[PDB]
C-alpha cells in the first residue's frame, strides 16, 4: 500500500524525459493493459511518432487517476489519449462499477483540460467471454454500456472519441474479430495496426486542424 497507483513504474522514465528537454506535440497514451501491450507489440509506432506510452497492465481507472499527475500532467504533453476501463471491467482488482469507472475517466479529462492538455477519449475494446464466467452477450453489453456514456460525454464536451470497438467487434455477439487477435482477449499486431490508423488520424486532427470559424 506504499505505492498503490504504481508511480514507481515510470518514475525513472519520466526523469529521463525531462533530461531530454522540451518536445513539441508530445502525445501521452494513458491506459491499462491495452496500452501497455500496444508498446510491447509495436514499439516503432510510438518511437517513430514521438508518442509516449504510459500503460500499466492490470491497473484500475481509480489508480490511473491517482498517477495522472505524474505520468501525464508533469510530462506537459500537447495531447493525452485516455484508454481506461478495460481492467475495471475485467475485475482483476475488485468488483466493476460503471458509475465509478466513468466518473474516473471524467476526472482524468478534467485534470487534463485544467492543465491545457487536449484529450482524446476511446472505446473499450471487445473481447471473448469465457462461458463459465459470462455469456458473450453479457460481456458485450457491459462494454457497450460504458462506451455509450463515454461517447455522450465526449459529444457534450466537444472531445474527440475514437471508436475502436465498432471496427473490431464482430457480429453477431460482439466477439473480438478473429483477424485482430491471437488469444481472443488482446489485440495481435494486425489489430493494433487497425487501432494505429484510427488513433493517428484523431491525433493529427487535434495537432493540425485549428481556428474553427464559427458562424
Amino acid at each position: 500500500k506504499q505505492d498503490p497507483a504504481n508511480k514507481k513504474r515510470y518514475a525513472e522514465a519520466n526523469k529521463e524525459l525531462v533530461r531530454k528537454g522540451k518536445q513539441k506535440n508530445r502525445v501521452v497514451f494513458m491506459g491499462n493493459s491495452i496500452t501497455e501491450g500496444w508498446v510491447a507489440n509495436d514499439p516503432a509506432f510510438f518511437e517513430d511518432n514521438g508518442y509516449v506510452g504510459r500503460g500499466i497492465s492490470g491497473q484500475t481507472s481509480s489508480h490511473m487517476l491517482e498517477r495522472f499527475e505524474e505520468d501525464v500532467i508533469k510530462l506537459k504533453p500537447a495531447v493525452v489519449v485516455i484508454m481506461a476501463g478495460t481492467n475495471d471491467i475485467a475485475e482483476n482488482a475488485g468488483p466493476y462499477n460503471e458509475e465509478q469507472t466513468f466518473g474516473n475517466i471524467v476526472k482524468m479529462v478534467e485534470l487534463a483540460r485544467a492543465a491545457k492538455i487536449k484529450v482524446i477519449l476511446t472505446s473499450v475494446l471487445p473481447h471473448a467471454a469465457a462461458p463459465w464466467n459470462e455469456s458473450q452477450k453479457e460481456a458485450t453489453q457491459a462494454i457497450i454500456n460504458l462506451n455509450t456514456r463515454i461517447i455522450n460525454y465526449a459529444i457534450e464536451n466537444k472531445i474527440p472519441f475514437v471508436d475502436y470497438f465498432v471496427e473490431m467487434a464482430q457480429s453477431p455477439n460482439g466477439d473480438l474479430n478473429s483477424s485482430y487477435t491471437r488469444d481472443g482477449v488482446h489485440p495481435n499486431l494486425e489489430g493494433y495496426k487497425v487501432m494505429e490508423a484510427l488513433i493517428k488520424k484523431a491525433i493529427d486532427k487535434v495537432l493540425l486542424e485549428h481556428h474553427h470559424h464559427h458562424h
Partner: antibody, heavy 129, light 109 residues
C-alpha cells in the same frame, strides 16, 4: 410537450403495401432511437422495429423481417414504416414510440433498448380484400 | 425472445397489485430493465414506471413499482375508477422488447 403524430393508416389489399409516418416534436428527435409497435384488435403489444438515432442501424421483429423497412428523416423529425406484402395478420393499430436512451449504440440486433417514454396516437391498418 | 407473463379484483379505494414474471432475469449490473404502462380504450399506452421502480412524471403517486430479476409488481395504493385499464409490463433488456398484459378490475357485489 413531446408529441408523436401518426398518419397514413387505412385499408390495404393483401400483398400490397403502405407507408406510415410519425411526425415528432418537442424533443431532439435526431438524438434518439425510434420504434414501431403494433396491437392487433383485442390483443397485446408487439414490437415491430427500431432505427438508431443516426439511421445507421435498423432491426425488425421476426414476424416482419423481409417485408418491412423502417426509415427516418432527421431534417423533418419524422419516422416512417414502409410495409410491403401485407397480410391479414398485419391488421393492427400501429404506434410509433420514442426510446428513452440518449444516442444508443445499436451495433447488434439483440442489445438492450430503452423504455418507451412517449407514444404516438396510433393509426389503424386493415389488411383485407 | 424473453417472455413476459402476468400471473394473477379489488374494491374501490383498496390496494391493487399486478404481478409480472420474465422468463429470464432482466436485471443487469444493478438496473432492472422493466417498465409499466397503462392503456385506456382508444389511446396509446402511457408510461407509468421505469427502471422497475421510478414513477414517471405526472403519474399519480398511488402508482408504484417494485421487484427485481424475474419478479415485478405494480401497486396501486388506492384503486380508483379511472384506474380500470389494461396494464403492460415491458422488458427492454434484450431486443425484441416484449410486453406482458393483464387487467385491473373493480371488485363489487
Amino acid at each position: 410537450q413531446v408529441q408523436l403524430v401518426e398518419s397514413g393508416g387505412g385499408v390495404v389489399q393483401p400483398g400490397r403495401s403502405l407507408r406510415l409516418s410519425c411526425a415528432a416534436s418537442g424533443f431532439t428527435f435526431s438524438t434518439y432511437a425510434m420504434h414501431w409497435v403494433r396491437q392487433a384488435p383485442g390483443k397485446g403489444l408487439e414490437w415491430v422495429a427500431v432505427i438508431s438515432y443516426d439511421a445507421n442501424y435498423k432491426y425488425y421483429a421476426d414476424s416482419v423481417k423481409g417485408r418491412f423497412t423502417i426509415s427516418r428523416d432527421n431534417s423533418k423529425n419524422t419516422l416512417y414504416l414502409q410495409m410491403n406484402s401485407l397480410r391479414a395478420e398485419d391488421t393492427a393499430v400501429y404506434y410509433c414510440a420514442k426510446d428513452s436512451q440518449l444516442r444508443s449504440l445499436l451495433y447488434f440486433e439483440w442489445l438492450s433498448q430503452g423504455y418507451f417514454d412517449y407514444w404516438g396516437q396510433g393509426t389503424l391498418v386493415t389488411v383485407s380484400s | 425472445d424473453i417472455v413476459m407473463t402476468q400471473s394473477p379484483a379489488v374494491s374501490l379505494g383498496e390496494r391493487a397489485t399486478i404481478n409480472c414474471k420474465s422468463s429470464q432475469s432482466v436485471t443487469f449490473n444493478y438496473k432492472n430493465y422493466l417498465a409499466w404502462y397503462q392503456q385506456k380504450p382508444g389511446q396509446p399506452p402511457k408510461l407509468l414506471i421505469y427502471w422497475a421502480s421510478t414513477r414517471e412524471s405526472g403519474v399519480p403517486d398511488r402508482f408504484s413499482g417494485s421487484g427485481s430479476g424475474t419478479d415485478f409488481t405494480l401497486t396501486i395504493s388506492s384503486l380508483q375508477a379511472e384506474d380500470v385499464a389494461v396494464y403492460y409490463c415491458q422488458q427492454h433488456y434484450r431486443t425484441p422488447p416484449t410486453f406482458g398484459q393483464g387487467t385491473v378490475e373493480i371488485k363489487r357485489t
